[PDB]
Design an enzyme around this catalytic site. Sequence first.
Site, mmCIF file in Angstrom:
data_model
loop_
_atom_site.group_PDB
_atom_site.id
_atom_site.type_symbol
_atom_site.label_atom_id
_atom_site.label_comp_id
_atom_site.label_asym_id
_atom_site.label_seq_id
_atom_site.Cartn_x
_atom_site.Cartn_y
_atom_site.Cartn_z
ATOM 1 N N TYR D 171 47.184 27.270 30.843
ATOM 2 C CA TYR D 171 48.512 27.404 30.256
ATOM 3 C C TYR D 171 48.836 26.172 29.424
ATOM 4 O O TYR D 171 48.426 25.057 29.757
ATOM 5 C CB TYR D 171 49.553 27.606 31.367
ATOM 6 C CG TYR D 171 50.975 27.812 30.885
ATOM 7 C CD1 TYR D 171 51.291 28.815 29.966
ATOM 8 C CD2 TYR D 171 52.008 26.990 31.348
ATOM 9 C CE1 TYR D 171 52.602 28.993 29.514
ATOM 10 C CE2 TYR D 171 53.324 27.159 30.906
ATOM 11 C CZ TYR D 171 53.617 28.159 29.989
ATOM 12 O OH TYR D 171 54.920 28.315 29.555
ATOM 13 N N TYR D 181 57.178 23.701 35.469
ATOM 14 C CA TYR D 181 55.774 23.869 35.818
ATOM 15 C C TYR D 181 55.384 22.597 36.566
ATOM 16 O O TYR D 181 54.682 21.738 36.016
ATOM 17 C CB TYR D 181 54.943 23.990 34.547
ATOM 18 C CG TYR D 181 53.594 24.628 34.748
ATOM 19 C CD1 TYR D 181 53.488 25.972 35.102
ATOM 20 C CD2 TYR D 181 52.418 23.903 34.541
ATOM 21 C CE1 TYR D 181 52.249 26.583 35.236
ATOM 22 C CE2 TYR D 181 51.167 24.506 34.673
ATOM 23 C CZ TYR D 181 51.093 25.847 35.019
ATOM 24 O OH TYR D 181 49.868 26.457 35.139
HETATM 25 N N1 LIG Z 1 51.205 35.004 34.692
HETATM 26 C C1 LIG Z 1 51.242 34.088 33.737
HETATM 27 O O1 LIG Z 1 52.392 34.126 33.055
HETATM 28 C C2 LIG Z 1 50.173 33.106 33.464
HETATM 29 C C3 LIG Z 1 50.113 32.379 32.277
HETATM 30 C C4 LIG Z 1 49.093 31.473 31.835
HETATM 31 C C5 LIG Z 1 47.988 31.226 32.728
HETATM 32 N N2 LIG Z 1 47.993 31.909 33.923
HETATM 33 C C6 LIG Z 1 46.888 31.764 34.881
HETATM 34 O O2 LIG Z 1 46.384 33.056 35.214
HETATM 35 C C7 LIG Z 1 45.659 32.876 36.467
HETATM 36 C C8 LIG Z 1 46.000 34.032 37.434
HETATM 37 O O3 LIG Z 1 47.408 34.027 37.664
HETATM 38 P P1 LIG Z 1 48.367 35.311 37.584
HETATM 39 O O4 LIG Z 1 49.529 34.683 36.890
HETATM 40 O O5 LIG Z 1 47.779 36.561 37.017
HETATM 41 O O6 LIG Z 1 48.822 35.448 39.003
HETATM 42 P P2 LIG Z 1 48.341 36.260 40.194
HETATM 43 O O7 LIG Z 1 49.376 35.773 41.175
HETATM 44 O O8 LIG Z 1 48.135 37.733 40.083
HETATM 45 O O9 LIG Z 1 46.871 35.662 40.558
HETATM 46 C C9 LIG Z 1 46.536 34.440 41.245
HETATM 47 C C10 LIG Z 1 45.690 34.757 42.435
HETATM 48 O O10 LIG Z 1 45.070 33.588 43.050
HETATM 49 C C11 LIG Z 1 44.880 33.861 44.443
HETATM 50 N N3 LIG Z 1 44.823 32.569 45.152
HETATM 51 C C12 LIG Z 1 45.586 31.478 45.509
HETATM 52 N N4 LIG Z 1 44.963 30.542 46.197
HETATM 53 C C13 LIG Z 1 43.675 31.034 46.313
HETATM 54 C C14 LIG Z 1 42.544 30.529 46.939
HETATM 55 N N5 LIG Z 1 42.532 29.381 47.596
HETATM 56 N N6 LIG Z 1 41.404 31.261 46.882
HETATM 57 C C15 LIG Z 1 41.388 32.411 46.177
HETATM 58 N N7 LIG Z 1 42.420 33.039 45.607
HETATM 59 C C16 LIG Z 1 43.560 32.275 45.677
HETATM 60 C C17 LIG Z 1 46.116 34.720 44.840
HETATM 61 O O11 LIG Z 1 45.912 35.650 45.871
HETATM 62 C C18 LIG Z 1 46.500 35.442 43.545
HETATM 63 O O12 LIG Z 1 46.081 36.830 43.516
HETATM 64 C C19 LIG Z 1 46.064 31.511 37.047
HETATM 65 O O13 LIG Z 1 44.958 30.667 36.879
HETATM 66 C C20 LIG Z 1 47.229 31.125 36.195
HETATM 67 O O14 LIG Z 1 47.330 29.729 36.096
HETATM 68 C C21 LIG Z 1 49.024 32.843 34.213
HETATM 69 O O1 LIG Z 2 49.773 29.012 35.251
HETATM 70 C C1 LIG Z 2 50.883 29.826 35.166
HETATM 71 C C2 LIG Z 2 51.714 29.736 33.966
HETATM 72 C C3 LIG Z 2 52.881 30.586 33.873
HETATM 73 CL CL1 LIG Z 2 53.869 30.543 32.535
HETATM 74 C C4 LIG Z 2 53.223 31.512 34.948
HETATM 75 C C5 LIG Z 2 52.392 31.598 36.140
HETATM 76 C C6 LIG Z 2 51.224 30.763 36.260
HETATM 77 O O2 LIG Z 2 50.459 30.879 37.434
HETATM 78 C C7 LIG Z 2 50.685 30.058 38.600
HETATM 79 C C8 LIG Z 2 51.709 28.996 38.738
HETATM 80 C C9 LIG Z 2 51.815 28.311 39.905
HETATM 81 C C10 LIG Z 2 51.016 28.517 41.044
HETATM 82 CL CL2 LIG Z 2 51.204 27.645 42.472
HETATM 83 C C11 LIG Z 2 49.928 29.569 41.032
HETATM 84 C C12 LIG Z 2 49.759 30.340 39.813
HETATM 85 CL CL3 LIG Z 2 48.577 31.520 39.750
#
Ligand SMILES: NC(=O)c1ccc[n+]([C@@H]2O[C@H](COP(=O)([O-])OP(=O)(O)OC[C@H]3O[C@@H](n4cnc5c(N)ncnc54)[C@H](O)[C@@H]3O)[C@@H](O)[C@H]2O)c1
Ligand SMILES: Oc1cc(Cl)ccc1Oc1ccc(Cl)cc1Cl
Lengths: 60, 60, 229, 229
Positions: D171, D181
Site C-alpha cells: 500500500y 495506517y
Molecule cells: N483491502 C485493501 O484496501 C488493501 C489495500 C492495499 C494493500 N492491501 C493488502 O492486501 C493484502 C490482503 O489484505 P485484504 O485487505 O484483502 O484483507 P483480508 O483481510 O481479506 O486478508 C488478509 C488475510 O491475512 C490472514 N492473516 C493474518 N495473520 C496471518 C498469519 N499469521 N498467517 C496467515 N494468514 C494471516 C487473515 O486471515 C486474512 O484473511 C494485505 O497484504 C494488505 O496489506 C489491502
Molecule cells: O494494507 C492495507 C491498506 C488499506 Cl487501505 C486497507 C487494508 C489493508 O490491510 C491490512 C491493514 C492492517 C492489518 Cl493489521 C492487516 C491488513 Cl491485511
Amino acid sequence: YTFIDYAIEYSEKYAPLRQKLLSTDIGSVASFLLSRESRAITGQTIYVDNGLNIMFLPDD
Amino acid sequence: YTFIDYAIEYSEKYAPLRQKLLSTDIGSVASFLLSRESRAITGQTIYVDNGLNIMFLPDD
Amino acid sequence: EDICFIAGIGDTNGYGWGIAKELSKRNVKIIFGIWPPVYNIFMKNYKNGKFDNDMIIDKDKKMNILDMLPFDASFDTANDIDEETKNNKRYNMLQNYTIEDVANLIHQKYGKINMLVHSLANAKEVQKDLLNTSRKGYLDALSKSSYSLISLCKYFVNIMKPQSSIISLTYHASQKVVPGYGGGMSSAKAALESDTRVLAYHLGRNYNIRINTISAGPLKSRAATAINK
Amino acid sequence: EDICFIAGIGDTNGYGWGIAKELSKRNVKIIFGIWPPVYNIFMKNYKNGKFDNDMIIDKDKKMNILDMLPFDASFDTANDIDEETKNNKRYNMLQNYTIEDVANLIHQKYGKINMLVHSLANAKEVQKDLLNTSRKGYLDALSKSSYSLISLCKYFVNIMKPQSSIISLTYHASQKVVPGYGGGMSSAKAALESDTRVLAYHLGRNYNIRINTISAGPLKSRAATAINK
Ligand SMILES: NC(=O)c1ccc[n+]([C@@H]2O[C@H](COP(=O)([O-])OP(=O)(O)OC[C@H]3O[C@@H](n4cnc5c(N)ncnc54)[C@H](O)[C@@H]3O)[C@@H](O)[C@H]2O)c1
Ligand SMILES: Oc1cc(Cl)ccc1Oc1ccc(Cl)cc1Cl
Ligand SMILES: NC(=O)c1ccc[n+]([C@@H]2O[C@H](COP(=O)([O-])OP(=O)(O)OC[C@H]3O[C@@H](n4cnc5c(N)ncnc54)[C@H](O)[C@@H]3O)[C@@H](O)[C@H]2O)c1
Ligand SMILES: Oc1cc(Cl)ccc1Oc1ccc(Cl)cc1Cl
C-alpha cells in the site's frame, strides 16, 4: 564499441534476470496494458528491463 | 467514520479513473504478473489504484 | 473489434514490431504509422516478401496488417508543413501524413479505434552530450519525442472509444544518468513520463481513457545503432 | 499445469479471493492457505455452500479449488510454535501449518508449483499511530507482514519450477504518509517493497524466479474494517 552494445552486454550480466530481452517481451506487456485486463492502471511508468533498474552496485 | 470508507470515497472522487476498484481488478493484474507474459518484469511495485498515486493536489 | 494504430515502425527490428507481433496474437487489427522518409523503402521490402518470416505468429498464423500509412509526428496539421519539406524528395508523392490527417484518414476508412501506441523518438543532436546540445537541437528532441505524444492524444481521442488505452516507450535515462544518451533525449523522456501522468488525469476524467508508458531495456534497433557513444 | 498457492484467505471479501477468481479463469489450480483462527469458520461456510455464488466465474465457470490447508505465517518450522498456540482451542486439532510444513505438504501431494501469492498482513497495534506503537507491536507487524514473505520464499523456492512467479500486496502508505495506517504497518510495507527488490536479485540470479509487489487501492475487506480510525 557503440553505446547499445555496451548497454546490452551490461544488462545481460548485471540484471536480476540474465536472459536476452526480446522486443516481444515488451510486446506482451504492451498487449496487457492496452487490454481491459489492466483497467485499474493508468499514468504509470512500468519497467520491462529484466529488473536492471533496481540495481545500484554491480557484482563485478 | 472508519478509515476505509474515507479512503474509498476519496479514491472514487479524486482518482484519474472514477470507477469502483474491484478485487478482481487487482486479480487480473496479479494474473498477468504470475504468467510468463511478464517474463521481463521483476522487483517492481506495480500500482493498481485507478491512478490515485499520481495525484498531488485534489481538485476541489 | 480491436484496432490499434502503432506510430513509429520503420522495420522489424524495433519495439514497434514486437508490439504489433504480440497484439495480433490476440487478433487485434493493426495499422502502421510510417515516417515518410522510409515509407517507400518499407513498402518495397514488404512487397518483395522481406518480412514474410517475421510476420509468422507462433500459433501458426499470419500477422494481419489492416493498413500502412505515411505519418510524421513533427506536423500537427496541414498548415504546419514547411515549404522545404513540402517539396522534399520523399514527401512529394505522399499526402495526409500529419497527425490530424492520419486521424481523419483512419476514421474515414475504419471507424473508431481503441488502442494507440506511441513508439517513436528523434533528436538532431543525440550524439552530443546535454551540455553541448544547442537550443534548436534540444527543442527538436522534445518536439519529436515528447510533444508528439500530446498531439497524438489530442487529435486521436476524437476517434477513440471510451475505455480505450494508450502507451508509449521511455528509457531509464530520464531518472538516472546514463552518459551517451544526449541531445536532450533524457530531457524528452523525463517530460514524456511526467506528461503521461498529467495526461492520465485529463484523459481519465474526461474520456475514461487510460495512458501509461513502458520503460524498456536495451534492444539493438536501428535507432539504437545511431547512438555513437 | 499451473498450480498457485495463495496465502491469506479468510473469506471472499479480500484481494486473495479476487486473485483466485481471476486465476481460475486461466485454469490454474488454486491451493488456499488459511489462518487457523478462521480455518474452521471458512470450511463451515464453504461446506454449507455460503460461497457458492462467489465461485461463479462469468463464463459459467466454477472456481476450482485444489486444496485448503491451515497456514500460519508467523511460524517458520514446526519447532517455532510455542506451547500455548500449540495447544490453543483453534490449533489443537490442526497440523503442519508452519511455512516449512505446508511447503513439504504441497510438494508431497502435488509436486512442484509455479505460482506463489502472498496476500497477508497483521499488526497488533494497528489502531495506534506510529509514535505510540511499542517495540513489541512494531516487531509484530514486521514479523507477520514482511518477514513472512522472505520465509515463504526461502522454503517454497525448493518446490517451485524455474521461471515461476511470486507476488505480494502493498500500500502507498509506505511512500507517502496516511494517518490511520499505524502500528508499524507503513513500516512493514516499506520493508516489503524494499525486500521485494533484494529478493528479486537473489531469486532471479539463483533460481530464475521472479517476484513483484502490487500496491493496491482501497478495498473494503474484513481487515480494512479493523483499522479503527
Ligand atoms: N483491502 C485493501 O484496501 C488493501 C489495500 C492495499 C494493500 N492491501 C493488502 O492486501 C493484502 C490482503 O489484505 P485484504 O485487505 O484483502 O484483507 P483480508 O483481510 O481479506 O486478508 C488478509 C488475510 O491475512 C490472514 N492473516 C493474518 N495473520 C496471518 C498469519 N499469521 N498467517 C496467515 N494468514 C494471516 C487473515 O486471515 C486474512 O484473511 C494485505 O497484504 C494488505 O496489506 C489491502
Ligand atoms: O494494507 C492495507 C491498506 C488499506 Cl487501505 C486497507 C487494508 C489493508 O490491510 C491490512 C491493514 C492492517 C492489518 Cl493489521 C492487516 C491488513 Cl491485511
Ligand atoms: N531500443 C531500445 O533499446 C529502447 C529502449 C527504451 C525505450 N526505447 C524507445 O522505444 C521507442 C521506439 O524505438 P526503437 O528503439 O524500437 O527504434 P526504432 O528505430 O525501430 O523506432 C523509432 C521510429 O520512429 C520513427 N520516427 C522518427 N521521427 C519520426 C517522426 N517525426 N514521425 C514519425 N516517426 C518518426 C522512425 O522511422 C523509427 O522507425 C522509442 O520511443 C525509444 O525511445 C527504445
Ligand atoms: O530511447 C532509447 C534508449 C536506448 Cl538504450 C536505445 C535506443 C533508444 O531510442 C532512440 C534514441 C535516440 C533517438 Cl534520436 C531515437 C530513438 Cl528511437
